Amino acid sequence: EDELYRQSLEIISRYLREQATGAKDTKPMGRSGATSRKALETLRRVGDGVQRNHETAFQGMLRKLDIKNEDDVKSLSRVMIHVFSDGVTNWGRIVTLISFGAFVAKHLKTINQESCIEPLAESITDVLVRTKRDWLVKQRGWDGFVEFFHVEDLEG
């Protein structure tokens, strides 16, 4: 059993679907639900900011990718490997990978290709986990992600 993969897929899939549909999935998480819940809540906060802070660049890359159908969505794995995997690994770049994923998912909703969203989530998860497992494990996986982005309450 690959717990890191399963957890990654659940978090990434949920975020992409919630971003596309604008509705929260009410179903419980699987194993390690408390961490997966906090991870999804962290992506909500941080992912939305990345999409807005890099709006122009996001729009430019989307137009360059020219995503119309299932076969274009399939071709994105190669591009993710090219851009994400072949560079420095840090939580910021992982958030961009997943946030751009959400950006693509919303686009797939707009062109009425919602069925490609879960395959896309699987592709993103494959790239993240299968190319960066060592780093992810060393950084404490999703617990580490949550701890990295944790914000202390302000006084007063």
Ligand SMILES: CN1C/C=C/CCCCN2C[C@@]3(CCCc4cc(Cl)ccc43)COc3ccc(cc32)[C@@](O)(C(=O)O)CC1=O
């Ligand atoms: C906030 N930014 C700048 C934004 C640039 C807009 C273009 C985004 C290109 N992609 C988007 C990326 C490459 C394009 C296809 C694709 C498809 C899906 Cl479904 C998810 C991600 C991607 C790979 O993920 C990236 C990871 C890190 C970076 C860029 C990535 C970058 O770190 C990088 O270029 O190395 C850039 C980054 O983090």
